[PDB]
Structure formats: C-alpha cells, structure tokens
Amino acid sequence: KKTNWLKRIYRVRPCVKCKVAPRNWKVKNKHLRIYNMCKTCFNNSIDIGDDTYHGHDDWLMYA
Amino acid sequence: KKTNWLKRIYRVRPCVKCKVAPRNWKVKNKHLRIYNMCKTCFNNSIDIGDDTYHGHDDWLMYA
Ligand SMILES: Nc1ncnc2c1ncn2[C@@H]1O[C@H](COP(=O)(O)OP(=O)(O)O)[C@@H](O)[C@H]1O
Ligand SMILES: Nc1ncnc2c1ncn2[C@@H]1O[C@H](COP(=O)(O)OP(=O)(O)O)[C@@H](O)[C@H]1O
Ligand SMILES: [Cl-]
Ligand SMILES: [Zn+2]
Ligand SMILES: [Zn+2]
C-alpha cells in the first residue's frame, strides 16, 4: 500500500509552475525524488532566470 | 510541503481493523513508521491470536 500512496500523491500534485503537467522525478538509489516542476517548466526556469520554484522532496521505497 | 503530505496521508487512513480510530505510529530515528492498527486494536489482536493485520510503513522526514 505504500506504493499506491506514492502513486496517489504523484497523481494529485501537478507542476507548481504550469499547474497542468505532472512533475518530473528521478529514482536516485532507493529513493524517489519528486521535483517541483515538469521538465519543460524547469528548463524554462533556467532560460528566464527564475529559480523561485526549484526544489523537490524524497520518498523511500520500502515498507 | 512533504510534512503536510505525511499529515494528510495519516489523517485519511484509519485503523484497518476498526475503521474508526487513527493508526498508531512511532518516530524511530529519523523515520516515521505508521502501523496498520490503533493501539487498542493491536493489543486485542495479540489477545485473540490474530496477526493478519500486523504491519506498518516507513516514511522519512526530510526534503
Ligand atoms: N524539474 C525540476 N523542478 C524543480 N527543481 C528542480 C528540477 N530539476 C532539478 N531541480 C533542482 O536542481 C537541484 C538538484 O538537482 P538534482 O539533479 O535533483 O540533484 P543532484 O544534485 O543529485 O544532481 C535541486 O535544487 C532541484 O530542486
Ligand atoms: N499498532 C500496530 N499495528 C499493526 N502492526 C503492529 C502494531 N504494532 C506493532 N506491530 C508489528 O510489530 C512488528 C514490529 O514491531 P516494532 O516495535 O514496529 O518494530 P521493532 O521490531 O523495532 O520493535 C511489526 O510487524 C509491526 O507491524
Ligand atoms: Cl517517504
Ligand atoms: Zn510545468
Ligand atoms: Zn482500531
């Protein structure tokens, strides 16, 4: 059930910048990192000079 | 925001056995463990001989 909760929280938090697309993520190690923004908004953030929305949280994948 | 998510998931999952009371939990280390059952149902499970509902998940408290 932890895995279904991770999935549920991933599906209810859209990108903070565009409010439509899902967030980017990576499986680092044995942690899942959910970044604040989709990939397209993150790259845009780099081009326009804004980093106010950079960030992420980590969730581990056991139990 | 991770902390508000942990709180949200704790508030939406009641005890698996009695379906009313919130689950028991402990802060082990720097992990939060949410057990499957309230304390009163867990102790009952020990007295009646059923362990079908024993278990828990772990959530870390960073990011
Ligand atoms: N898609 C994204 N949305 C928001 N923040 C991001 C995104 N991608 C990268 N970042 C930011 O980049 C920084 C770290 O990059 P990352 O590759 O996660 O870690 P590492 O330092 O291991 O490469 C963090 O502050 C992270 O929030
Ligand atoms: N309230 C509860 N609800 C469900 N399972 C429980 C509960 N309390 C203890 N358990 C079970 O007891 C076992 C481990 O006990 P616990 O104290 O969490 O770990 P430790 O082995 O570090 O003492 C686990 O299988 C756990 O699910
Ligand atoms: Cl977690
Ligand atoms: Zn976006
Ligand atoms: Zn109960």
Residue numbers in the entry:
A (entry chain A), B (entry chain A): 9 to 71
Text lifted from the article:
DNA sequencing of the output from this selection revealed a distant clone (clone 18-19) that differed from the consensus sequence at 15 out of 80 positions and bound ATP with far greater affinity and specificity than all other clones from that round of selection. The X-ray crystal structure for protein 18-19 was originally solved by Lo Surdo et al. and found to adopt a novel zinc-nucleated α/β-fold not yet observed by nature. The fold is characterized by an α-helix (residues 6–20), followed by an extended loop, then two short β-strands (residues 33–36 and 39–43), followed by a second α-helix (residues 46–56) that leads to another extended loop which terminates in a third β-strand (residues 64–68). A zinc metal ion is bound by tetrahedral coordination to four invariant cysteine residues at positions 23, 26, 46, and 49.
Protein 18-19 was the highest affinity clone isolated from round 18. Unlike many naturally occurring proteins, protein 18-19 requires high concentrations of free ligand in order to remain stably folded and soluble. We determined the X-ray crystal structures of protein 18-19 and the evolutionarily optimized variant, protein DX, to resolution limits of 2.8 Å and 1.65 Å, respectively. The structure of protein 18-19 was solved from the anomalous X-ray scattering of a zinc ion bound to the protein using multiwavelength anomalous dispersion (MAD) methods. The Cα backbone trace of proteins 18-19 and DX can be superimposed with a root mean square deviation (r.m.s.d.) of 0.51 Å from residues 7 to 71. In protein 18-19, Asp65 is located on the hydrophobic face of the third strand and forms a salt bridge with Arg21, while Asn32 is located on the polar face of the first strand and contacts the purine base of ATP through a bridging water interaction. Experiments performed in the absence of ATP showed that protein 18-19 forms an insoluble precipitate after 3 days, while proteins containing one or both of the selected mutations remain soluble after 7 days. Small differences in the relative positioning of the ATP molecules in the two protein structures cannot be resolved due to the limiting resolution of the 18-19 structure.
